[PDB]
A paper describes a structure:
Genome segregation is a fundamental process that preserves the genetic integrity of all organisms, but the mechanisms driving genome segregation in archaea remain enigmatic. [name] has a tertiary structure folding similar to those of the ThDP-binding fold superfamily, but [name] shares only 5–15% sequence identity with those proteins. Surprisingly, we found that [name] exhibits nucleotide triphosphatase (NTPase) activity and assembles into filaments in the presence of nucleoside triphosphates (NTPs) and DNA.
During the crystallization trials, we also observed another crystal form under different condition after a couple of months of crystal screening. The r.m.s.d. between the SegCm and [name] monomers is 0.42 Å (in Cα), implying that the overall structure does not change much. Thus, the extreme C-terminal region of [name] is crucial for dimer formation, as its degradation destroys the AB dimer interface, preventing dimer assembly and even further affecting the genesis of multimers.
Numbering used by the authors: 1 to 155
Amino acid sequence: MFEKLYSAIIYSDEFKKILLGRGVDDLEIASAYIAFLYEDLPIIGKNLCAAFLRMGLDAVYNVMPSGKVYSPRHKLYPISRYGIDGVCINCDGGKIILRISNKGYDPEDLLESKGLESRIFVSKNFKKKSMEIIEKIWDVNKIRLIARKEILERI
């Protein structure tokens, strides 16, 4: 059920390393979990992992210099914008605001929440926990190599 989520995280991590020289961060990873739960919710702010979930490899065409994605058709926006509302990733410009906190959801518990509150809190080490799970189940080095090759053919 979750293959698209794991692949979005690996592909976005490899793409960000190619473009900006660093991997995706905790909030960017959390955006893919939110996008996995709410297909119709605009995601505003740190959203690269959500973009690979919604757009696949086509996400590479819509990345801003900041590493955030602009794609109205997929309800992805890099900054607060007139006429859009949704979840603002670690920003105040939204009717739902997502932040990191000590008592925030771990990845698995986030995916089990039934209900969209106005304030979403995710645990610290969100990336670490997501990445530990994926390396446990998949041959991540092999997938990373395929992802890099496929990304570079589009770039």
